[PDB]
Amino acid sequence: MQSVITDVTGQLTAVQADITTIGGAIIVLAAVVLGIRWIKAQFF
Amino acid sequence: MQSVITDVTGQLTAVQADITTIGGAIIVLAAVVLGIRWIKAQFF
Amino acid sequence: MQSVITDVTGQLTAVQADITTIGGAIIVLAAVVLGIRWIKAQFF
Amino acid sequence: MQSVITDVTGQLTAVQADITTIGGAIIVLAAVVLGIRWIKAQFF
Amino acid sequence: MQSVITDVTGQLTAVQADITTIGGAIIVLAAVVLGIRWIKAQFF
Amino acid sequence: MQSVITDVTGQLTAVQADITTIGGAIIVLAAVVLGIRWIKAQFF
Amino acid sequence: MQSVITDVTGQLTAVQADITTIGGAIIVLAAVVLGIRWIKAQFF
Amino acid sequence: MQSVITDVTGQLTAVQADITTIGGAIIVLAAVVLGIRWIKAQFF
Amino acid sequence: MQSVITDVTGQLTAVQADITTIGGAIIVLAAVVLGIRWIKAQFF
Amino acid sequence: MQSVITDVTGQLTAVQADITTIGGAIIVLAAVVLGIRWIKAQFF
Amino acid sequence: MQSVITDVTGQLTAVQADITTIGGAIIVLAAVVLGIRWIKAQFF
Amino acid sequence: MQSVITDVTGQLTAVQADITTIGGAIIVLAAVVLGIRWIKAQFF
Amino acid sequence: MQSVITDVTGQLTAVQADITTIGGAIIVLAAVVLGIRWIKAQFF
Amino acid sequence: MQSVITDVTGQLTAVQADITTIGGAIIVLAAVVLGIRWIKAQFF
Amino acid sequence: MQSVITDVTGQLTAVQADITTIGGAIIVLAAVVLGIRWIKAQFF
Amino acid sequence: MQSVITDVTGQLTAVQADITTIGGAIIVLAAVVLGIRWIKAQFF
Amino acid sequence: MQSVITDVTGQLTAVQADITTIGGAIIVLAAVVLGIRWIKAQFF
Amino acid sequence: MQSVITDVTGQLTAVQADITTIGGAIIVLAAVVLGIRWIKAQFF
Amino acid sequence: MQSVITDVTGQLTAVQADITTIGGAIIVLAAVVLGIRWIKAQFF
Amino acid sequence: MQSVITDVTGQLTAVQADITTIGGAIIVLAAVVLGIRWIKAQFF
Amino acid sequence: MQSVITDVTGQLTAVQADITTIGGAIIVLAAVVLGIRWIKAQFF
Amino acid sequence: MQSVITDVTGQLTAVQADITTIGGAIIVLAAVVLGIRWIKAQFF
Amino acid sequence: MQSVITDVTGQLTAVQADITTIGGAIIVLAAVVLGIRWIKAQFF
Amino acid sequence: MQSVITDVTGQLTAVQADITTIGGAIIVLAAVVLGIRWIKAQFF
Amino acid sequence: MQSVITDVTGQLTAVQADITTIGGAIIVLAAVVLGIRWIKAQFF
Amino acid sequence: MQSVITDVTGQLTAVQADITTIGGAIIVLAAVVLGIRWIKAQFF
Amino acid sequence: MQSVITDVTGQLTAVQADITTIGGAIIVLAAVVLGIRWIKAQFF
Amino acid sequence: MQSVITDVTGQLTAVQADITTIGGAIIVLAAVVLGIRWIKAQFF
Amino acid sequence: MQSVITDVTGQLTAVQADITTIGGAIIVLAAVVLGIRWIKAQFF
Amino acid sequence: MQSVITDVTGQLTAVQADITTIGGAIIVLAAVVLGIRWIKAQFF
Amino acid sequence: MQSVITDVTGQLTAVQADITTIGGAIIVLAAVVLGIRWIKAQFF
Amino acid sequence: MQSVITDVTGQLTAVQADITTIGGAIIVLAAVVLGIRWIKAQFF
Amino acid sequence: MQSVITDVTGQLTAVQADITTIGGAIIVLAAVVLGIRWIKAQFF
Amino acid sequence: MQSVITDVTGQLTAVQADITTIGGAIIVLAAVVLGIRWIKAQFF
Amino acid sequence: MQSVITDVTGQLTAVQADITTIGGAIIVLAAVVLGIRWIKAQFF
């Protein structure tokens, strides 16, 4: 029934935010991996 | 009888929408898994 | 008698249409299960 | 659920500091590789 | 965790001293390359 | 006599409706067994 | 008689709700199996 | 009866918590697999 | 039951320590790969 | 279990010594590459 | 194992001699480049 | 007589409770078969 | 009679414990299949 | 009966040791795959 | 049974030697790749 | 089995000779690059 | 196989001649750069 | 008479032991089917 | 009678050995599937 | 009977040789994939 | 049967030649990449 | 089959000519870089 | 294909003219650096 | 009479051999289904 | 009777050949799937 | 019967050609991926 | 059938042209990267 | 399809202009590096 | 896109002015090095 | 009588052909299910 | 009767075409999955 | 019936366009990943 | 359906802008890496 | 989403300032390398 | 972050003083080279 659909959706969206919130958090690390590494280069 | 057929159909279609509505919801997550991950790459 | 045969047939065919009409309806769901799922893949 | 997201975040940030703290430490070496090497040049 | 960071640091600093200690040692050679060479000049 | 026949019929038909009315009711359960189960799959 | 039919129905519907109510409950587990598992992936 | 439904539910929810509680526990390992591995990279 | 959850957890945490203890051990090698290699550079 | 951890460690350390012992050996070559090359310079 | 280390060493040293033996050979050329060139100067 | 009917009923109902009481008891096993088995999966 | 019910129950519960006790025992194997396998990965 | 449970357990544990004993044995290979491979790298 | 374990082990160890014996053989090539290549450098 | 090991070795050694035989051949070119180039210098 | 070695050699030598043949050709230019330049000097 | 009952019982119990004794015997095979099969998996 | 039980057992055990003897035989193949396959990897 | 076991074995071993004989054959290809590829590298 | 083995071999060898024949062909390109590139160098 | 080999070769050679034809073309530029640059020198 | 070669050539030549046209232009400057400088000399 | 028993037995055994003789014959097919299928795997 | 057995066998063997003859045919495809695919790799 | 075998074969071979014909077609793309890519390199 | 093969081919070729047409387009960029860069050099 | 090719081209060309437009811009700097530097020389 | 080009240019020009502005500044020093030095000459 | 036997046979054989004729027809579908599916794989 | 056979066939073939017609349609998607994906690669 | 085939096709084609339309969209990102990255290079 | 396509596109484009917006931001750093570095050169 | 873009930018700019601030700092050293060195010249 | 910049600066300045302090020290030597040399002149 519709029950299944609108309700499988209510979650499918709700979980997105979770996924994306976790991705951002990880990226700040990439951003910092380039912090620690652009610097080494500058010397050599 | 026809009773069985047209009526087994009335549902078979009605349930599709449910299935598909749930699929879309999940895909937005895939779309976001590529949000969190294309970004990491950019650093390295 | 023939009564039995031609008349058991009149139904055997009439019920087919019902069976098949119900099968089509279900397949549109399979078709949609591949809608929701080919998409996830594309990300990863 | 949100459980997943805010909690995957609580770590994603917490780990950044670790990454960056390790990068700084390494850079002080680059800074010193230029200590030992600018000096050789001065002679020749 | 912090475990990673403060501990990746404990080394990053500890290794600096090594790098720099090795650089000084090499420079004393540059200093001596200018010993052997300023002298030749003086003749000509 | 005919008494027996037309009258055994008056029931044979009358009872059909009962049988079929009970079958439909049960099928809505099958329809729901596929509600609860197509969903689990989607996760894994 | 009709007795049989309308009354076999009164149950056939009443039991549906039970079946479906049990299915939903189980699905929330699938939904959580994808909670615990999408997360592992993110690391590797 | 309703007996079946509300009672199949009382469990379906109760078991979720179990599933999810087990998932979290496992993820902390993923989180640590990225502890042990981001570090190796930093050297090379 | 809860039995499953709190008990699947008692392990999920207990195994983390194992994973992480093994990661640290490996990293000390990375740390040493940079020992053997920063040195070669210094010559050339 | 702990079995995994303390025992994955017993090796992680044991292998370090191997790695480092091999690095030293190679460096003595760098040290000699600067033997053969500082000399050529002196002429020109 | 130790196997790796003491054995990676047995070579690291053995190859040094090769490197250095080749360097000496080349230097005798530098020594001779200064043979052919100090002489030209003397005229002018 | 009515004797037969109301009295065949007094039992037909009384025995239901027995049947159903036995069914519940068995289901708690199914519920536990999913306890022991969802867990294995989680590893692999 | 009730005899049947309360007594079919006395077993239905008694057997649960058996089922579940056997499930736990098996899971400790899954837990160990992940012991032997997370380790291989770490190398490659 | 309990017979089933305590006795299905007596094995479930007894077999664990077997599984784990086999896992350790395999891991020593992973440990050696990293023996043969870290070495190649060192050259290039 | 123990049969499985001690016997899965008898092989797990026996195969290690094979793996490692093959790794050594390959490394002698790395060792030689550095033979052919350190030499080219010396010219330029 | 041993089959794997002694036989993976029979090749690992056999291929070395090939690698090294190819390296020597290339080096004679380096040796000649210094033939063509030390000469130009002599003029200027 | 030997195939690789003796055949990588057949080229390594064949290409030498090419390299050296090209070097000689260039040197005749150095020889001429000293033709055009020793002459200017003679005037001043 | 009671003759029938207590005596039909004296057997009903006596035969149980037989049934159960035969079941255990068979299960040891299941236990061994998992011996021969968990092992194959480990390879692949 | 007991006849049934002790005698259904005499076989249930006797057949185990057969099952297990066949499992071992098959596993030696798994063991060899990992012979032929770990090797390919080593190249690439 | 034993018939089953010793005879399921007579094959389980006989088939091993087949499996392994096929694996060796394939590996000689890996060995050659490293023939064609180590060579390209040498140029660049 | 042996059928499988000797016949899986008849191919495993037959395909080697193909692989290797293709590798040689590619290498002649590497050999030529060093033709076009050693030359540029000579100018600068 | 041979199909693969002789045919992978038919290309491997055919592509060489392309590679080499492109290299020559580029070298004429090196040859000209030494045209434009030997000249500047002559002045100073 | 030939496509690659004759077409990589069509450019390799076309670009030469560019390189050489730029070299000539620069040389006229060298020619003029000797204009401005031979003159100063004449005084002193 | 005994007539019935010993004579119903004379057959019960005589027919076993038939059953078992037919089972063996079929199994050789299973054995061959694993012939045709282990092979496909090896490719992929 | 024996009739059943020796005659159920006459087929059980006769059908094997069919099964196996069909398996070989399919494998030649696997063998070719590795024809078309090892080749792609070689490029990249 | 033989019917099954020789006829399952008539196809197993017939389909090979199809598989292989499709593989060749794809490889010409790999061959071209190396067309477009070896070229970029040449510049840098 | 042949259907599969000749038709999988009709595409395999048709797609090549696409791949190659895209490669050429990209190379013109490499060709231009050497436009912008050979020029900088000329100054210094 | 062609779709891919002509359209991957429409960009490959369009991006060239971008690359080249950026190169010119940079070269004007080289041209100016020779502005600031030819001048210093003139003094000394 | 054009975006890249016109915008990489907007900078390439903007940076020129910087380069040249810095060159002029330095030259005034050359101009002054000839101030301090033409004067010494005049005495001697 | 024999009447029964030879005549029950005349059919038992006659019907076989029917069964088998229907089986072949179905298999051509399996053969085609592998047509449509081996193809998808080739892409991914 | 034959009725069954030739008529079960008339369908078995008729349905093939359907199966295969559906397979082709799906494959064009695989063909396009490789359209969208070979392209991404080209960039990176 | 044909019903199945022509109708499974009507979709198989209709879905292609969807797949391909999604692929193009993604590629424009690859095209832009090379926008952001060719640029960084130009500096260094 | 079209649903999938036009909607997978609506994102594929929307995400481009994101990718490109992030690339520009990074390039301004390259542009600045050449700020800090062209300057050092000017001294030496 | 835009989320990704404007936010990847907010950093890309923020990090520039860091890069450039570090470059200036280094240049003041170049400026001083010309302090210590123009002076030596003045003597000789 | 700013962290990087202000902190890369804190050093860039701190190191200047070092560079300059070393330059002064060297210049006092130039100053003395003119001490020892103006004197010789005075005689001749």
Cβ J15 vs Cβ I32: under 8 Å: no
CA distance T41 to N4: 64
Specify the 3-state DSSP secondary structure of T10: helix
Residues near V32 by Cβ (< 8 Å), separated by ≥ 6? W16, W19, W20, W23
Amino acid symbol at P28: V
The two structure tokens encoding residue X22: 């037919």
Do U1 and X35 lie within an 8 Å CB cutoff?
Answer: yes
Per domain, the residue ranges of chain AH are 1-44
Residue whose token pair is 């500890």: E14
Cβ contacts of O13 on chain N, cutoff 8 Å: 25, 28
CA dihedral over AC27, AC29, AC35, AC40, signed as positive or negative: negative
Amino acid symbol at AA37: R
Cβ contacts of AH1 on chain B, cutoff 8 Å: 35
Do Z22 and AD31 lie within an 8 Å CB cutoff?
Answer: no
The two structure tokens encoding residue A13: 């969206």
Cβ S27 vs Cβ T14: under 8 Å: no
CA distance W7 to L41: 58
Cβ G27 vs Cβ F44: under 8 Å: no
Q: Identify which of B12, AF21, C27 has the alpha carbon closest to the alpha carbon of residue AG4.
A: AF21
CA distance AB21 to AC2: 9
Cβ contacts of N33 on chain S, cutoff 8 Å: 38
Cβ contacts of F41 on chain A, cutoff 8 Å: none
Phi, psi of AF22, rounded to the nearest 5 degrees:
-75, -35
Instruction: For residue U27, give how far its alpha carbon lies from the nearest alpha carbon of chain Z (Å).
Output: 13
C-alpha distances (whole Å) from AD23 to each of Y18, Z11, AA1, AE3, AE4 are: 15, 16, 20, 15, 12
Residues near AG32 by Cβ (< 8 Å), separated by ≥ 6? AH16, AH19, AH20, AH23
Q: At what angle do helices N2-43 and S2-43 cross, to 10 degrees?
A: 10
Cβ T13 vs Cβ U5: under 8 Å: no
Please tell me if residue Q28 touches chain P, with a CB cutoff of 8 Å.
no
Q: What percent of chain S is helix, strand and coil (3-state, nearest 5)?
A: 95, 0, 5
Long-range contacts of Q6-12 (CB under 8 A, 24+ apart): Q6/P21, Q8/P18, Q8/P21, Q8/P22, Q8/P25, Q8/T39, Q8/T42, Q9/P21, Q9/P22, Q9/P24, Q9/P25, Q11/P25, Q11/U31, Q12/P22, Q12/P24, Q12/P25, Q12/P26, Q12/P28, Q12/P29
Q: Identify which of AD1, B29, D24 has the alpha carbon closest to the alpha carbon of residue E5.
A: D24
When scoring N13, N27, N32 by the number of chain J Cβ atoms within 10 A, the one with the most, hence best to mutate, is N27
Cβ contacts of AC22 on chain AG, cutoff 8 Å: 39, 42
Q: How many residues does chain T have?
A: 44
Query: For Z34, which residue in chain AE has the nearest alpha carbon?
Result: AE42
C-alpha distances (whole Å) from I11 to each of G33, I6, W5 are: 18, 9, 63
Q: Identify which of V2, H34, F29 has the alpha carbon closest to the alpha carbon of residue I27.
A: H34
- Please list, residue by residue across F15-44, b when 16 or more beta carbons sit within 10 angstroms of its beta carbon and e when fewer do: eeebeebbebbbebbebbebbbebbeebbe
Residue whose token pair is 């030469």: W16
CA distance H27 to D10: 14
Q: Identify which of D16, D22, D23 has the alpha carbon closest to the alpha carbon of residue E8.
A: D22
The two structure tokens encoding residue L9: 């009923």
Do AA8 and AD39 lie within an 8 Å CB cutoff?
Answer: yes
Do A35 and AI8 lie within an 8 Å CB cutoff?
Answer: no
The CA-based dihedral angle spanning residues J9, J13, J18, J22, taken in that order and rounded to the nearest 10 degrees: 130
Instruction: For residue D2, give how far its alpha carbon lies from the nearest alpha carbon of chain G (Å).
Output: 10
- Reported resolution in A? 3.1
Q: For residue A16, with 0-12 CB atoms within 10 Å meaning exposed, 13-18 middle and 19 or more buried, which class applies?
A: buried
CA distance AI26 to Q6: 58
The DSSP secondary-structure symbol of K44 reads -
Instruction: For residue P13, give how far its alpha carbon lies from the nearest alpha carbon of chain O (Å).
Output: 6
CA distance AF33 to AG16: 9
The two structure tokens encoding residue R20: 């159960």
| Nearest CB to R42 within list N3, N11, N22 | N22
The two structure tokens encoding residue AC5: 């080009």
When scoring AD13, AD20, AD34, AD40 by the number of chain AE Cβ atoms within 10 A, the one with the most, hence best to mutate, is AD40
The DSSP secondary-structure symbol of AE44 reads -
Do I1 and L42 lie within an 8 Å CB cutoff?
Answer: no
The two structure tokens encoding residue AG7: 């909607």
C-alpha distances (whole Å) from P20 to each of N43, P26, AE26 are: 14, 10, 52
Residues near B4 by Cβ (< 8 Å), separated by ≥ 6? C15, C18, C19, C22
Do AB26 and AF38 lie within an 8 Å CB cutoff?
Answer: no
CA distance AF24 to AF16: 12
SS3 of chain H: CHHHHHHHHHHHHHHHHHHHHHHHHHHHHHHHHHHHHHHHHHHC
**Phi-psi category of residue AA2: left, alpha or beta, with phi > 0 → left and psi -120 to 50 → alpha:** alpha
Q: At what angle do helices T2-43 and O2-43 cross, to 10 degrees?
A: 10
When scoring K4, K11, K15 by the number of chain N Cβ atoms within 10 A, the one with the most, hence best to mutate, is K4
Instruction: For residue A1, give how far its alpha carbon lies from the nearest alpha carbon of chain AH (Å).
Output: 32
The two structure tokens encoding residue F38: 């197509």
Specify the 3-state DSSP secondary structure of L44: coil
CA dihedral over W6, W8, W14, W20, signed as positive or negative: negative
Cβ Z34 vs Cβ AA20: under 8 Å: no
CA distance AF30 to AE42: 8
Cβ contacts of C42 on chain AG, cutoff 8 Å: 8
CA distance L36 to L32: 6
User: How far is C-alpha R5 from the chain's CA centre?
Assistant: 26
Do AD35 and AA3 lie within an 8 Å CB cutoff?
Answer: yes
Residue whose token pair is 């066998």: Y9
Q: Identify which of F42, F19, F30, G18 has the alpha carbon closest to the alpha carbon of residue B11.
A: F30
Q: What is the CA radius of gyration of chain J?
A: 20
The CB density around residue E20, as the number of other CB atoms within 10 Å, is 17
Q: How many residues does chain U have?
A: 44
Residues near M31 by Cβ (< 8 Å), separated by ≥ 6? I11, I15, L43
Backbone break loci in chain N, preceding residues, C–N > 2.5 A: none
CA distance Y14 to Z1: 7
| Cα maximum dimension of chain AB | 66
Cβ contacts of Y38 on chain T, cutoff 8 Å: 29, 33
| Cα maximum dimension of chain AD | 66
Cβ contacts of AE30 on chain AB, cutoff 8 Å: none
User: How far is C-alpha AB15 from the chain's CA centre?
Assistant: 12
The DSSP secondary-structure symbol of A1 reads -
Q: Which of residues 7-26 of S touch O (CB under 8 A)?
A: 20
Cα end-to-end span (Å), chain AD: 66
The CB density around residue V25, as the number of other CB atoms within 10 Å, is 22
Q: Identify which of AD28, L3, V21, J22 has the alpha carbon closest to the alpha carbon of residue AE18.
A: AD28
Instruction: For residue AH24, give how far its alpha carbon lies from the nearest alpha carbon of chain B (Å).
Output: 24
Cβ contacts of N38 on chain I, cutoff 8 Å: 29, 33
CA distance D16 to A25: 8
Q: How many residues does chain N have?
A: 44
Do S18 and T5 lie within an 8 Å CB cutoff?
Answer: yes
Do AA8 and AD35 lie within an 8 Å CB cutoff?
Answer: no
Instruction: For residue S8, give how far its alpha carbon lies from the nearest alpha carbon of chain X (Å).
Output: 16
Instruction: For residue H4, give how far its alpha carbon lies from the nearest alpha carbon of chain D (Å).
Output: 28
Instruction: For residue S5, give how far its alpha carbon lies from the nearest alpha carbon of chain T (Å).
Output: 18
Amino acid symbol at C9: T
Cβ contacts of P4 on chain S, cutoff 8 Å: 35, 39
CA distance AC20 to AA43: 14
Q: Identify which of Q25, P14, H43 has the alpha carbon closest to the alpha carbon of residue J20.
A: H43
Cα end-to-end span (Å), chain AH: 66
Instruction: For residue S38, give how far its alpha carbon lies from the nearest alpha carbon of chain N (Å).
Output: 10
CA dihedral over I11, I17, I21, I22, signed as positive or negative: positive
Q: What is the CA radius of gyration of chain V?
A: 20
Give, in degrees to the nearest 5, the angle at Cα AB32 between AB26 and AB36. Answer: 145
C-alpha distances (whole Å) from Q34 to each of P36, P40, P42, Q10, U42 are: 17, 10, 9, 38, 20
Residues near AH19 by Cβ (< 8 Å), separated by ≥ 6? A38, AG29, AG32, AG33, AG36, AI4, AI5
Where does AB1-44 sit in CATH, by number? Answer: 1.20.5.440
DSSP class per residue in R1-44: -HHHHHHHHHHHHHHHHHHHHHHHHHHHHHHHHHHHHHHHHHH-
The two structure tokens encoding residue E24: 């000084």
Cβ contacts of Z3 on chain AD, cutoff 8 Å: 20
CA distance H9 to G26: 8
DSSP class per residue in E21-34: HHHHHHHHHHHHHH
Instruction: For residue AE16, give how far its alpha carbon lies from the nearest alpha carbon of chain AB (Å).
Output: 29
Do D19 and A36 lie within an 8 Å CB cutoff?
Answer: yes
CA distance I16 to H28: 7
The two structure tokens encoding residue J31: 């040290």
Q: Identify which of M21, N13, D11, G28 has the alpha carbon closest to the alpha carbon of residue H18.
A: G28
User: How far is C-alpha AE8 from the chain's CA centre?
Assistant: 22
The DSSP secondary-structure symbol of D37 reads H
Cβ E5 vs Cβ D18: under 8 Å: yes
C-alpha distances (whole Å) from X12 to each of X16, AF36, AH31 are: 7, 84, 109
CA distance E23 to E31: 13
Do A38 and AH26 lie within an 8 Å CB cutoff?
Answer: no
The CA-based dihedral angle spanning residues W14, W20, W24, W25, taken in that order and rounded to the nearest 10 degrees: 60
Do D30 and A42 lie within an 8 Å CB cutoff?
Answer: yes
Cβ contacts of U20 on chain Q, cutoff 8 Å: 3
C-alpha distances (whole Å) from G18 to each of A14, E6, G12, L24 are: 27, 57, 10, 14
The two structure tokens encoding residue AD28: 């051509």
Cα end-to-end span (Å), chain K: 66
Q: At what angle do helices K2-43 and O2-43 cross, to 10 degrees?
A: 0
CA distance U11 to T26: 9
